[PDB]
Design an enzyme around this catalytic site. Structure first.
Site, PDB file in Angstrom:
ATOM      1  N   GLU D 764       0.253  -1.390  -8.072  1.00  9.85           N
ATOM      2  CA  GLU D 764       0.063  -1.684  -6.647  1.00  9.85           C
ATOM      3  C   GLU D 764      -1.177  -0.902  -6.219  1.00  9.85           C
ATOM      4  O   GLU D 764      -2.220  -1.012  -6.884  1.00  9.85           O
ATOM      5  CB  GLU D 764       1.332  -1.397  -5.856  1.00  9.85           C
ATOM      6  CG  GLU D 764       2.471  -2.360  -6.144  1.00  9.85           C
ATOM      7  CD  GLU D 764       2.182  -3.768  -5.672  1.00  9.85           C
ATOM      8  OE1 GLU D 764       1.362  -3.932  -4.743  1.00  9.85           O
ATOM      9  OE2 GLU D 764       2.771  -4.716  -6.233  1.00  9.85           O
ATOM     10  N   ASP D 765      -1.127  -0.117  -5.147  1.00  4.69           N
ATOM     11  CA  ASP D 765      -2.295   0.616  -4.687  1.00  4.69           C
ATOM     12  C   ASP D 765      -2.299   2.075  -5.119  1.00  4.69           C
ATOM     13  O   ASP D 765      -3.245   2.795  -4.795  1.00  4.69           O
ATOM     14  CB  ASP D 765      -2.397   0.529  -3.162  1.00  4.69           C
ATOM     15  CG  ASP D 765      -2.576  -0.893  -2.673  1.00  4.69           C
ATOM     16  OD1 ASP D 765      -2.653  -1.808  -3.519  1.00  4.69           O
ATOM     17  OD2 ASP D 765      -2.639  -1.097  -1.442  1.00  4.69           O
ATOM     18  N   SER D 766      -1.289   2.524  -5.858  1.00  3.99           N
ATOM     19  CA  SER D 766      -1.182   3.940  -6.176  1.00  3.99           C
ATOM     20  C   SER D 766      -2.251   4.369  -7.176  1.00  3.99           C
ATOM     21  O   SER D 766      -2.875   3.554  -7.858  1.00  3.99           O
ATOM     22  CB  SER D 766       0.205   4.263  -6.721  1.00  3.99           C
ATOM     23  OG  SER D 766       1.079   4.636  -5.671  1.00  3.99           O
ATOM     24  N   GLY D 903      -4.616   4.363  -1.345  1.00  4.51           N
ATOM     25  CA  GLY D 903      -3.424   4.409  -2.160  1.00  4.51           C
ATOM     26  C   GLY D 903      -2.903   5.823  -2.267  1.00  4.51           C
ATOM     27  O   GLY D 903      -3.621   6.796  -2.023  1.00  4.51           O
ATOM     28  N   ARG D 935      -9.209  -7.917  -3.432  1.00  6.41           N
ATOM     29  CA  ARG D 935      -9.826  -7.195  -2.325  1.00  6.41           C
ATOM     30  C   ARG D 935     -11.344  -7.205  -2.427  1.00  6.41           C
ATOM     31  O   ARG D 935     -12.033  -6.994  -1.423  1.00  6.41           O
ATOM     32  CB  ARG D 935      -9.272  -5.772  -2.279  1.00  6.41           C
ATOM     33  CG  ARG D 935      -7.762  -5.757  -2.425  1.00  6.41           C
ATOM     34  CD  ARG D 935      -7.107  -4.763  -1.507  1.00  6.41           C
ATOM     35  NE  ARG D 935      -6.852  -3.486  -2.158  1.00  6.41           N
ATOM     36  CZ  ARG D 935      -5.672  -3.117  -2.633  1.00  6.41           C
ATOM     37  NH1 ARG D 935      -4.616  -3.906  -2.546  1.00  6.41           N
ATOM     38  NH2 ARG D 935      -5.546  -1.921  -3.199  1.00  6.41           N
TER      39      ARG D 935
END
Ligand SMILES: [Zn+2]
Ligand SMILES: [Zn+2]
Ligand SMILES: [Zn+2]
Ligand SMILES: [Zn+2]
Lengths: 148, 151, 114, 1134, 227
Positions: D764-766, D903, D935
């Site tokens: 994900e964004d981590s 993130g 993105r």
DNA sequence: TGAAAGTACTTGAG
RNA sequence: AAGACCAGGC
DNA sequence: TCAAGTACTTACGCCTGGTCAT
């Protein structure tokens, strides 16, 4: 829905005391063909001429004939409105409307409705609510062959 | 595509553009211009996609479905594309011109928000501003949709 | 089509009917002034409003640096190579993307459409 | 003498000169200086003299005097107040205002005695920091550090009770300008309006509407294409026909009205459209009857005809278009301007002029600190005069004498300014609802970029709850004026806006020299003008006021431009717009217009020559600056509506050169197109390679990044202060970061970032952080929390004392430990304090002692850094205790690059566990490759590549947006020269196994930011704690040990689950459980004495049949409230 | 209250259309268990009448008009006599009108007498919420704060006491009207502080009072935000 | 500066 | 002690 | 009966914090 405005190119209110005078020289050739037979002629007709010119393209795109417009005008405004149409062949379509008086003699003096402003009110009413063709509230109809 | 748009503009300026039924002259002109630009962006995207090797990671995350789409690859590599506000080309905010840098009545792709460059290439200042205008609409929709959908 | 003003109180004149001579008259409703009509036409309405926009174009628009200009269309009057062109810039223009050309160089100010 | 292919150096030299001369907060500084130097005096003078009466007393105010910000210490001893003293002691950094007052008496003895009161104090005006009247003006960096002031602090904010307040520019529609719109469903087909203000001297605004009545019949007159124009004058009940308004101005004949309305009688369509308006007003044919008609529809109809006529004449003379005129013979000018409004309405109806759009920034004005403070001070000074008049009238009925010093209440001005700057409600405190709120925000000190963004910020006054998307859209006119990327994501999207780097806002000027020049340059006044000569001529507007017509507009515009370039009669603020199609020249000198400098292109060449650049290169010890460039006629300030008439070149060496011709009439050139971005969007490397939403997200995130927000953070006792251990300047920088002072005060560290999928903890964004790097200080930060406490004397014997309480001397007491307090009840710095420890020990004397000590915020676990003791305004003991806590980056903290890639930290691996290159390089941060494709932050990848090139080369990479000389291929070729794969990929080895990773990983130094959002500040857990007093439900907020809200959506979700018991638990058991005793006959609650077991229902005499009912306490409260409204919600158990 | 007034004869408590009439029988048959639709149907029937006759009496009915919190009766087409075609219809007059409506007649109006009678819709005894509804806030124990409800109740008590004292003393018959208007404002603003066209109750510092309706009305209210 | 949509009441118009 | 506002987060 | 006015309402989910004046 097609009102009179959708097919009118220009509308002008003239002053013609005598129809044979025909202040518009282009209308003299054919206006004399209609006054050989008198609708009410001699009986005092309003000397005011509601002359409306009909757009050729906007009227051929709807298969509208000047006779149909004349019938609609007669139906919507009674027998107290003379209407004359030039011709389909004529390079410009011309409709001439007068305000023929009842002429019943004798029979509300304040209720006069001057013919100069009466013609203007009639012209506005015709251009807004003539409903020459179609159904009201139907602004535009699209025609296409579906692919879905 | 730009030459085709110039030809369409020349036809419109010479009254040679016959209006498609159900559309006005401006509407049919915009339809033709959008068709040309969209076809150009689709062709450039296909060309960019065909150039990707099996080791390309954009293609790797697209074919897997994890993240991204072919339009992202096209915009990164080939062409960002037309920027639209309210479903139309970038409006003439100034008098008959989109920006002070354009002449009036400029209906070409550059003036109306078509980004010829890709993200890898980088956008020109006019393209940068038009892309900002395009993304502002998405930001507004995101911030405004939540309340109505919740209601 | 036009509007005529009174020659006594400078108020607007309204058309009136002469019952005796059967001649159109413009009569003031504020005083007793009357006059004979020359045009004999009272009201003109152009629904198609097909008006030559060249009448509504100012010759000074040739001084606008923000408008495009070309040498391909020379002026009809003075034959000047440079000319500045623009679209209608007007509402209710029906369906028209045509170009209106104004001649550059001072004092000519010729306007034409092509 | 030209600059070919040397343009990159020259443009940035001129930009550097601009930002050296101007700065970033110059708009606020100039606005406040104009308010103090000009606006205050004009407001004081424009106030009518106080006339009272038999003797007559007259009060006149001559001149206002300002001093430096001084503090009257308790007793009164005047003393220079430094801003740091204002912050520490919660003082207001304000300067006393003195006005000379002349009092004259009339004793009817032919001799009038006048007494002059010099330097009469009337109030203290809060002083913007680093302004002309601030104490920090003209001080060197050494002098600023001597006062513990940061030299890099831009100023531009006020200090009210220690808090730093920044005034946000308020948008408003430009006044005195005619606007024509077309509403959709209104009764008006087209509506013209003109908000008129009389040179901002007095009165807020009077708006006049000239509208055309739809299309349907108006009873008996409308039979044409759309007509019946009407006018909506202020202070009049309903519509007035426009011809009646003209007749009320003294023009009776229709020809005069038409000459004032229609400028060429040869046009028949316009006269046809105006005819029925004449027809409607045919009955009125005299000036007096028109005045009577207007007056009869006023606020209250007059008793007699003459008072109605006088009232209507006063309304038309004063309240109708006051900017045209307010005195006597201005009837002709008002008629001309009203006819202009009707002419505009007719042109819009005829389709000859396009309708104006509200989003055009040329139609907008920005109310900066100056205008806002002037608006507040006008009302405050009017109220002060009202109170002085009340006092004088009360004291004059005795006839003894009159005193002015006691009559003036300086508290009114001081408290009005201080309240409106403090609370932000712009208006009177009693009228806070009618007052606009949100003005004067608290200055954001999270980061220096955040402070700059807050000091350069604009606000649209429209409602945030409004769902209309058009005002939120990015209008084309915002180019170079407002940042296209920096917008508050959320309910303020598009509404709160920020200034571009080169953007300037006009401070205002008096249009007397311009009008004098126009008279001296021929022209023709409207009074001397024959209306027949007005169609061919061009109307000349100055600040909306139509002053006359000019027959040679080209020459006039050339002369005006020459004057503004030479700075002879026209200052650079003034905007001059020529509408060639509409024959109008509009000149604006008013404040609020947003303008930016542009180079001037004469013929096809720049006026910026090589000599200007050579002189600017030696800017030091040469006295050659940006002002010399402007005074030389090279650069010009152009606002939006003048930018309409400009032909702009983006770059000189590309667009002015001869090629396949597109434009040859360029009149201006961009200094640099990167100047369209604001402060926060200018720290983005390669922003033109990113998706615009990502640029907006980074613009929002930069104000949340942590660095060294200010150099004097040691002296600042600020709540919620974050400082970074090792801030680094970016390896890839923009040419604007030099002017943003980002190198001096950076927020972030260049981190070796691998865009890789290592163990799934960056999914994900981590992000995955290097635990060993974090141990070596990577992204370490300090959190500072300041606690304020104040002793007070409220009751007759009630008082507050700072002291260390003993076990039994105070009635209230907590289980906390007070052993850390000193003899003064204050913990000394260096004392390690955990949660629940007492910061300050305070006792309240109860009419023995009651504990009012302050404790730490839960689980802070910090160490006391600094303790400050002083006296506040009241002279009482005032303490500020700053507690520092070092916050090592955990696996919940938020990190982001300069490309919207935000993130949290998924996990931290040590050096051995992290993947490593053949050289032993282990990434400090690992981000997932899946964050990039959708993105589309290609500027992130290019930034990484350029940073890898620059770190190996030893330079700082240039990432200015539109360069055309920094391509990705060039960066790749440069990287290939240092033994690395040109695309930035590098072969990595698995840390756990030592094996090569089959795919080569993209590794390079990418600048990353540590955001304010940290898991420890956001982690909360509730288990049966405090409850609300009224609802008896769990408290609200993490700080109040509150419980999470199980809202209506959660309830619906549990209904869909069919979990009736869990729903009952959440909405009845987990929250307030309650029992009531209701009667069985009626459903109303009964008196229940459980100990005595005597249950009685008053109303039925029911003591036997009373039932016990378990209901939520909120439901009992609802039923009691319904009973309070006479509703009987009878709960029936049968 | 206005709707019920329009359905009954002024100063003669009797339904304008009788229950024995077939239309009311049809309305009752259709509206069993639906008192609100019954009332709206009876109101539609009775809004078109101008005389109280089938029944008893017969006198021209007024036109009830609302202006804020005040009711005015317009007696167009009155006989002569007292006339006064513009009275200020007081709550007392309406209470006396409704007290005489029979249980059957009010049942036809949809108001069941044993649950809600029309005269009970006029505030004669004002309920006072318990201390739990309007909690007092302890500030260090030195002083006690009060709710907005408590302040509004204090205003109501003050104006009620002033009106009672003036009634006992006699006053001037117009200060009595002013006190009645002020008491009506306070009572109606305690229940609802969002009536259009009326001033809002501000305790001090220019903050509008949060009425019971505002407590119960929207999100963050009682039902939405607490139940 | 700038909401829109539904509705219940209210009012002349038949 | 809990309201107003403001800023922010997702 | 009608239908065109005019008054009158009503749209954000959760979460954080800060400051300010009662
Ligand atoms: Zn006359
Ligand atoms: Zn020529
Ligand atoms: Zn009971
Ligand atoms: Zn009766």
């Amino acid at each position: 829905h097609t009102t009179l405005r959708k097919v009118t190119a220009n509308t002008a209110i003239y002053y013609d005391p005598n129809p044979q005078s025909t202040v518009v020289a282009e209308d003299q050739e054919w206006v004399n063909v209609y006054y050989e037979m008198p609708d009410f002629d001699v009986a005092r007709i309003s000397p005011w001429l509601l002359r409306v010119e009909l757009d050729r393209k906007h009227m051929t795109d709807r298969k509208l004939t000047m006779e149909q417009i004349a019938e609609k005008i007669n139906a919507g405004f009674g027998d107290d409105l003379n209407c004359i149409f030039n011709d389909d062949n004529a390079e410009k379509l011309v409709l001439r409307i007068r305000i023929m008086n009842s002429d019943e003699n004798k029979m509300e003096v304040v209720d006069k409705m001057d013919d100069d402003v009466f013609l203007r009110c009639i012209e506005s009413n015709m251009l807004t609510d003539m409903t020459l063709q179609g159904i009201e509230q139907i602004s535009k109809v699209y025609m296409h062959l579906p692919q879905t | 595509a730009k030459q085709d748009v110039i030809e369409v503009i020349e036809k419109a300026h010479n009254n040679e553009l016959e209006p498609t039924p159900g559309n006005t002259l401006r509407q049919t002109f915009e339809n033709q211009v959008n068709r040309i630009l969209n076809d150009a962006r689709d062709k450039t995207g296909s060309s960019a996609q065909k150039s990707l090797s099996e080791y390309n990671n954009f293609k790797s995350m697209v074919v897997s479905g994890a993240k991204g789409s072919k339009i992202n690859i096209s915009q990164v590599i080939a062409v960002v594309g037309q920027q639209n506000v309210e479903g139309k080309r970038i409006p003439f905010g100034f008098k008959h011109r989109t920006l002070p840098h354009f002449i009036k009545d400029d209906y070409g792709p550059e003036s109306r928000g078509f980004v010829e460059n890709s993200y890898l290439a980088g956008l020109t200042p006019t393209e940068f501003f038009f892309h900002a205008m395009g993304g502002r609409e998405g930001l507004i929709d995101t911030a405004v949709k939540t309340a109505e959908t919740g209601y | 089509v036009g509007i005529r003003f009174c020659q006594e109180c400078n108020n607007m004149l309204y058309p009136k009917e002469d019952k005796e001579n059967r001649i159109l008259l413009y009569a003031c409703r504020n005083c007793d002034y009357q006059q004979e009509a020359d045009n004999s036409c009272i009201y003109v309405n152009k629904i198609t409003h097909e008006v030559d926009e060249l009448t509504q174009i100012i010759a000074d628009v040739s001084q606008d640096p923000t408008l495009p200009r070309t040498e391909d269309h020379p002026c009809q009057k003075c034959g000047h190579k440079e000319a500045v062109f623009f679209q209608s810039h007007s509402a209710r223009a029906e369906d028209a993307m045509r170009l209106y050309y104004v001649c550059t160089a001072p004092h000519c100010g010729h306007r034409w459409t092509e | 003498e030209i600059t070919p292919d040397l343009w990159q150096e020259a443009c940035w030299i001129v930009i550097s000169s601009y930002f050296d001369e101007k700065g970033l907060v110059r708009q606020q500084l100039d606005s406040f200086d104009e308010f103090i130097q000009m606006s205050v005096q004009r407001i004081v003078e424009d106030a009518p003299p106080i006339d009272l009466q038999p003797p007559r007393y007259l009060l006149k105010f001559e001149q206002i005097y300002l001093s430096k910000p001084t503090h009257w210490e308790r007793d009164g001893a005047p003393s220079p107040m430094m801003p740091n003293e204002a912050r520490l002691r919660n003082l207001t950094y304000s300067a006393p205002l003195y006005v000379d007052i002349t009092k004259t008496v009339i004793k009817e003895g032919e001799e009038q005695l006048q007494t002059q009161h010099q330097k009469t104090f009337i109030g203290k005006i809060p002083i913007m920091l680093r302004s002309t009247y601030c104490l920090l003006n003209g001080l060197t960096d050494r002098d600023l550090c001597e006062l513990n002031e940061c030299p890099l602090d831009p100023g531009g904010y006020f200090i009210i009770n220690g808090s730093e307040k920044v005034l946000i520019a308020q948008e408003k529609m430009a006044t005195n300008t005619v606007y024509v719109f077309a509403k959709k469903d209104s009764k008006y087909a087209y509506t013209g309006e003109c908000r008129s203000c009389l040179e901002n001297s007095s009165r807020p605004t009077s708006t006049i509407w000239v509208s055309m009545l739809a299309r349907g019949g108006q009873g008996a007159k409308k039979s044409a294409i759309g007509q019946r124009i009407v006018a909506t004058l202020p202070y009049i009940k309903q519509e007035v026909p426009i011809i009646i308004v003209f007749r009320a101005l003294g023009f009776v004949s229709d020809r005069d009205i038409l000459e004032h309305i229609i400028y060429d009688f040869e046009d028949p369509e316009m006269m046809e459209m105006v005819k029925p308006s004449l027809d409607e007003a045919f009955v009125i044919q005299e000036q007096n009857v028109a005045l009577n008609f207007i007056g009869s529809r006023g606020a209250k109809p007059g008793v007699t005809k003459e008072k109605r006529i006088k009232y209507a004449k006063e309304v038309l003379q004063k309240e109708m278009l006051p900017h045209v005129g307010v005195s006597d013979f201005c009837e002709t000018k008002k008629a001309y301007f009203l006819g202009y409004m009707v002419h505009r309405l007719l042109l819009a109806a005829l389709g000859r002029r396009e309708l104006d759009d509200r989003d055009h920034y040329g139609n907008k004005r920005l109310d900066l600190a100056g205008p806002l403070l002037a608006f507040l001070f006008r009302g405050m000074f009017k109220n002060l005069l009202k109170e002085v008049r009340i006092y004088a009238q009360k004291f004059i009925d005795r006839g003894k004498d009159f005193n002015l010093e006691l009559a003036i209440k300086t508290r009114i001005i001081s408290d009005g300014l201080k309240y409106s700057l403090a609370t932000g409600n712009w208006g009177d405190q009693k009228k806070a609802h009618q007052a606009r709120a949100g003005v004067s925000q608290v200055l954001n000190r999270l980061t220096f970029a955040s402070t700059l963004s807050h000091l350069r910020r604009l606000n649209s006054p429209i409602g945030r709850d409004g769902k209309l998307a058009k005002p939120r859209q990015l209008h084309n006119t915002l180019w170079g004026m407002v940042c296209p990327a920096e917008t508050p994501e959320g309910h303020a999207v598009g509404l709160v806006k920020n200034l571009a780097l080169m953007a300037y806002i006009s401070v205002g000027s008096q249009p007397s020299p311009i009008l004098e020049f126009l008279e001296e340059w021929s022209m023709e006044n409207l009074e001397e003008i024959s209306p027949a000569a007005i169609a061919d001529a061009t109307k000349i507007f100055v600040n909306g006021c139509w002053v006359g017509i000019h027959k040679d507009p080209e020459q006039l515009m050339n002369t005006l431009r020459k004057l503004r370039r030479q700075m002879d009669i026209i200052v650079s603020e003034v905007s001059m717009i020529r509408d060639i199609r509409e024959r109008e020249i509009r000149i604006y000198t008013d404040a609020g217009r947003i303008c930016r400098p542009l180079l001037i292109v004469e013929k096809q060449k720049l006026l910026l020559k090589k000599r200007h650049i050579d002189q600017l290169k030696e800017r030091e010890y040469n006295n050659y600056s940006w002002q010399d460039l402007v005074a030389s006629g090279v650069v010009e300030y152009i606002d939006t509506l003048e930018e309409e008439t400009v032909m702009l070149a983006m770059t000189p060496d590309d667009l002015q050169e001869k090629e396949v011709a597109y434009c040859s009439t360029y009149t201006h050139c961009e200094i640099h197109p990167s100047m369209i971005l604001g402060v926060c969007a200018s720290i983005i490397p390669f922003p033109d390679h990113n998706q615009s939403p990502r640029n907006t997200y980074q613009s929002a995130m930069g104000k949340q990044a942590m660095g060294v927000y200010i150099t004097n953070f040691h002296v600042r006792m600020d709540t919620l202060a974050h400082v970074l251990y090792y801030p680094q300047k970016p390896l890839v920088t923009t040419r604007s970061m030099e002017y943003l002072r980002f190198r001096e005060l950076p927020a972030g560290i260049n981190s070796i970032v691998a865009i890789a999928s290592y163990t799934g903890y960056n999914q994900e964004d981590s992000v995955i952080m290097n635990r060993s790097a974090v141990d070596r200080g990577f992204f370490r930060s300090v959190f500072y929390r300041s606690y304020k406490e104040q002793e007070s004397k409220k009751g007759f014997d009630q008082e507050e004392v700072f002291e260390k309480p003993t076990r039994e001397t105070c009635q209230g007491m907590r289980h906390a430990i007070y052993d850390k307090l000193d003899d003064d009840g204050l913990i000394a710095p260096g004392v390690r304090v955990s949660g629940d420890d007492v910061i300050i020990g305070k006792t309240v004397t109860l009419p023995t002692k009651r504990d009012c000590s302050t404790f730490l915020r839960t689980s802070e676990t910090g160490i006391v850094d600094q303790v400050m003791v002083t006296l506040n305004q009241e002279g009482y003991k005032f303490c500020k205790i700053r507690v520092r806590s070092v916050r090592i980056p955990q696996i919940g903290d938020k990190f982001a690059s300069r490309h919207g890639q935000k993130g949290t930290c998924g996990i931290q691996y040590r050096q051995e566990d992290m993947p490593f290159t053949c050289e032993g390089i282990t990434p400090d941060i690992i981000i997932n490759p899946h964050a990039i494709p959708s993105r589309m932050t290609i500027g992130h990848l290019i930034e990484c590549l350029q940073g890898k090139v620059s770190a190996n080369k030893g330079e700082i990479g240039d990432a200015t947006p539109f360069n055309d000389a920094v391509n990705v291929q060039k960066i790749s070729n440069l990287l290939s020269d240092y033994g690395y794969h040109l695309r930035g990929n590098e072969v990595l080895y698995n840390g756990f196994t030592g094996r090569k990773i089959t795919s080569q990983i993209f590794i390079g130094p990418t600048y990353y930011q540590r955001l304010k959002h940290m898991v420890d500040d956001k982690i909360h857990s509730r288990a049966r704690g405090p409850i609300q007093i009224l609802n008896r439900q769990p408290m609200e907020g993490r700080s109040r040990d509150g419980g999470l809200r199980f809202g209506e959506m959660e309830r619906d979700c549990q209904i869909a689950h069919g979990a009736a018991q869990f729903l009952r638990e959440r909405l009845f058991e987990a929250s307030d459980p309650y029992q009531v005793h209701v009667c069985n006959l009626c459903g109303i609650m009964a008196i229940a004495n459980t100990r005595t077991h005597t249950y009685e229902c008053r109303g039925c005499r029911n003591k036997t049949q009373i039932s016990l009912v378990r209901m939520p306490y909120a439901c009992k409260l609802l039923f009691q409230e319904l009973m309070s409204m006479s509703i009987a919600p009878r709960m029936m158990s049968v | 209250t206005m709707k019920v007034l329009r359905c009954v004869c002024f100063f003669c408590s009797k339904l304008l259309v009788d229950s024995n009439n077939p239309k009311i029988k049809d309305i009752l048959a259709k509206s069993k268990g639906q008192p609100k639709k019954r009332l709206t149907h009876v109101y539609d029937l009775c809004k078109g009448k101008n005389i109280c006759e089938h029944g008893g009496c017969g006198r021209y009915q007024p036109r009830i008009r609302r202006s804020g919190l005040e009711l005015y009766a317009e007696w167009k087409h009155v006989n002569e006599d007292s006339q006064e075609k513009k009275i200020l219809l007081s709550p007392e007059r309406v209470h006396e009108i409704f007290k005489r409506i029979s249980d059957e007649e009010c049942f036809v109006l949809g108001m069941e007498p044993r649950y809600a009678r029309p005269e009970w819709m006029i505030v004669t005894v004002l309920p006072v919420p318990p201390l739990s509804v309007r909690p007092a806030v302890v500030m260090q124990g030195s002083a006690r704060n009060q709710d907005d409800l408590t302040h509004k109740l204090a205003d109501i008590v003050k104006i009620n006491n002033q009106l009672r004292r003036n009634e006992q003393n006699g006053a001037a018959a117009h200060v009595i009207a002013e006190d009645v208007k002020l008491l009506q404002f306070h009572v109606a603003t305690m229940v609802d502080n969002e009536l259009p066209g009326l001033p809002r109750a501000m305790q001090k510092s220019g903050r509008p009072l949060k009425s019971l309706k505002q407590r119960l009305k929207g999100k963050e209210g009682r039902v939405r935000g607490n139940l």
